[PDB]
Design a protein around this ligand. Structure first.
Ligand SMILES: *[C@@H]1O[C@H](CO[C@@H]2O[C@@H](C)[C@@H](O)[C@@H](O)[C@@H]2O)[C@@H](O[C@@H]2O[C@H](CO)[C@@H](O)[C@H](O)[C@H]2NC(C)=O)[C@H](O)[C@H]1NC(C)=O
Ligand SMILES: O=C(CCC(O)(O)[C@H](Cc1ccccc1)NC(=O)c1ccccc1)N[C@@H](Cc1ccccc1)C(=O)O
Ligand SMILES: CC(=O)N[C@@H]1[C@@H](O)[C@H](O)[C@@H](CO)O[C@H]1O
Ligand SMILES: *[C@@H]1O[C@H](CO)[C@@H](O)[C@H](O)[C@H]1NC(C)=O
Ligand SMILES: [Cl-]
Ligand SMILES: [Cl-]
Ligand SMILES: [Zn+2]
Length: 586
């Protein structure tokens, strides 16, 4: 009775105070992210001590409650969560050192540049990413690929071993075995590893076929002397810095070159699209579903484009919740092209989620699981990418209809959606093994590439050496942001697309579905999002789809036509799926 009452009272206080403290912290973190300076860094590190103080205080009190003797389900869940102090469990000295290391890694990544002797210095966004996406010259791609790793990657190495030591220490102090074990607990699912492995295995026929097909095309453009038709693909040729998405080399793999084009950049530019207009369109798609519009304040405080006042900023896109239920922002160095419009939708998906669960106790303001949070935005972007919708935006002449234009579309989608499966799976497999200690610092890079070869069928264009730390050249590594969430997202977003389309009355091939304006679709998601982190995620999964598991079925259904086409096309050329000569390197 009174224990239950003491618990209930504790949660209420934790909420009121956390809102204030958390809001304050977000403010300083935002000031640092949109203006990297010595002052803002100082203020951020100091705010780290403030929020840590609050976290230590309430966490300690939370641990005195005996959760598993508390009646109410919502309060028992909140208190269990508060008992996890995360970084605040570290002794004062280790905390300050850990906080600095995280700040230093993030800054190093976000300010790194690759320069030409006595010429121009390029930044990742938008310079280097543009080169990786548009250059079709082996040497130019190589320069940007190797340079980005020399400058950003190598620069993170000095910090990573201490970072692993400290984040692991914190996890242990919180009852976990290592940091990887702590990250996985976010999905409250004992069978997570096996469940993910199975999903990955299911998308292997599709990936191997896409892989073999793309390899053949790269062999055509880059020469037989540079592409082994039975080996891994040079990692700097896929149109993206980390070869995580391949749509930027669509021009080199177009199944039916005769079909009506679907380039939209020149159209977006000519028709005066701007970052602003790009986010407005995402907002309109959301409201078209009967979902929430971003607040007037969003447009006033967000950083929707890279500043031109000489401010140094963290360009990697991110959505921000300031924990007051009114202030939400996006910080994106937006460029005008379809690929970034898709990123804009992704970010807006996070914002929608913030607005949907804003009225829940701050402890429960999270996605059912990190995967869900990443998926929302992507679901709508699937509809936006269809020829039909792009045409309705005037970015396309026609939407086609021909089976050829149809295979071309699935191919462009697969270049991003399917190629991402093994990359997204790989990242944390590497980290979990780094966190559990099976991969020591002397083996960081070698193990990374063993995974790059094993899962993606990729090989580095130039031998790696002692001092290289390629993982460091990928944002989430130095920023300490879990990655398995994106793997889950990519699987489940198709399950959601499939459910929202059925709810919208769509009939026929799933890839032809566009939920724009469907209030039914909007309601399916809203009900699930409002739950925040209050219930086990399988409940949110069922509300949306009707079943409670993760499943690759939706994604396979979406790509079935392409799989069949790829099979026949690859067998016609007698392609050997996989990379037997796995040891080959350009
Ligand atoms: C278990 O408690 C939850 C939460 O109760 C609220 O938070 C407490 C700390 C205290 O401030 C209570 O007075 C609050 O009501 C109950 O769920 C809430 O129920 C109210 C009214 O039905 C609703 O408006 C809230 O949105 C609910 N919040 C959540 C997170 O669901 C719940 O009813 C209690 N369960 C039982 C069996 O009593
Ligand atoms: O990194 C992102 C988008 C950034 C983000 O929106 O996921 C962002 C990352 C981040 C940044 C700083 C601190 C923590 C995480 N996450 C969020 O904005 C976010 C995440 C959870 C809750 C609320 C906001 N996407 C991945 C995968 C991806 C997804 C979709 C298209 C392309 C690529 C990538 O680019 O490699
Ligand atoms: C608009 C508003 O007051 N929303 C509050 C929210 O901030 C708080 O976290 C929650 C407590 O669970 O109660 C809601 O009513
Ligand atoms: C950037 O931060 C510094 C440090 O506080 C401050 O002097 C400057 O005014 C800020 N610039 C902007 C764009 O607000
Ligand atoms: Cl790499
Ligand atoms: Cl995650
Ligand atoms: Zn995200």
């Amino acid at each position: 009775v009174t224990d239950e009452a003491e618990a209930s009272k504790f949660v209420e206080e934790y909420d009121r105070t956390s809102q204030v403290v958390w809001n304050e912290y977000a403010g300083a973190n935002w000031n640092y992210n949109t203006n990297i300076t010595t002052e803002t860094s100082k203020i951020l590190l100091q705010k780290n001590m403030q929020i840590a103080q609050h976290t230590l205080k309430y966490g300690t009190q939370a641990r005195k409650f005996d959760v598993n003797q508390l009646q109410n389900t919502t309060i028992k869940r909140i208190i269990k969560k508060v008992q996890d102090l995360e970084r605040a469990a570290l002794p004062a000295q280790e905390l300050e050192e850990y906080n600095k290391i995280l700040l230093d890694m993030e800054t190093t990544y976000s300010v790194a540049t690759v320069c030409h002797p006595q010429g121009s210095c390029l930044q990742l966004e938008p310079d280097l990413t543009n080169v990786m996406a548009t250059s079709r010259k082996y040497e130019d791609l190589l320069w940007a690929w190797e340079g980005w790793r020399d400058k950003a990657g190598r620069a993170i190495l000095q910090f990573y071993p201490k970072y692993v030591e400290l984040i692991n220490q914190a996890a242990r102090l919180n009852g976990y075995v290592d940091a990887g074990d702590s990250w996985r607990s976010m999905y409250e699912t004992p069978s997570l590893e096996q469940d993910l492995e199975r999903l990955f295995q299911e998308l292997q026929p599709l990936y191997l076929n896409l892989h073999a097909y793309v390899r053949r095309a790269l062999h055509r453009h880059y020469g037989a002397q540079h592409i082994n038709l039975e080996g891994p693909i040079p990692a700097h040729l896929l149109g993206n810095m980390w070869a995580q998405t391949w749509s930027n080399i669509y021009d080199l793999v177009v199944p039916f070159p005769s079909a009506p084009s679907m380039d939209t950049t020149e159209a977006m530019l000519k028709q005066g699209w701007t970052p602003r207009r790009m986010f407005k369109e995402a907002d309109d798609f959301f409201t078209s579903l009967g979902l929430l519009p971003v607040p007037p304040e969003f447009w006033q405080k967000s950083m929707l484009e890279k500043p031109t006042d000489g401010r140094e900023v963290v360009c990697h896109a991110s959505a921000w919740d300031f924990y007051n239920g009114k202030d939400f922002r996006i910080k994106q160095c937006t460029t005008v092209n379809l690929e970034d419009l898709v990123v804009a939708h992704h970010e807006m998906g996070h914002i929608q989620y913030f607005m949907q669960y804003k009225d829940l106790p701050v402890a429960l303001r999270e996605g059912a699981n990190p995967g869900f949070h990443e998926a929302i935005g992507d679901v709508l972007a699937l509809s936006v990418s269809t020829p039909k919708h792009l045409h309705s935006l005037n970015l396309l002449s026609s939407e086609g209809g021909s089976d050829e234009h149809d295979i071309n579309f699935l191919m462009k989608m697969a270049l991003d959606k399917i190629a991402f499966i093994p990359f997204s799976y790989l990242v944390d497999q590497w980290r979990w093994r780094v966190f559990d200690g099976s991969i020591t610092k002397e083996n960081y890079n070698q193990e990374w590439w063993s995974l790059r070869l094993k899962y993606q069928g990729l090989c580095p264009p130039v031998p790696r050496t002692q001092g290289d730390f390629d993982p460091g050249a990928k944002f989430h590594i130095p920023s300490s942001v879990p990655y398995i969430r994106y793997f889950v997202s990519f699987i489940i977003q198709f399950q959601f697309h499939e459910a929202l389309c059925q709810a919208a009355g769509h009939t026929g091939p799933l890839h032809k579905c566009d939920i724009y304006q469907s209030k039914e679709a909007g309601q399916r998601l809203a009900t699930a999002m409002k739950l925040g982190f209050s219930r086990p995620w399988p409940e949110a999964m069922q509300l949306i789809t009707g079943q409670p598991q993760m499943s690759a079925s939706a994604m396979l259904s979406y790509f079935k036509p392409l799989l069949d086409w790829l099979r026949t096309e690859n067998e016609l050329h007698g392609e050997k799926l996989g990379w037997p000569q796995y040891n080959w390197t350009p």
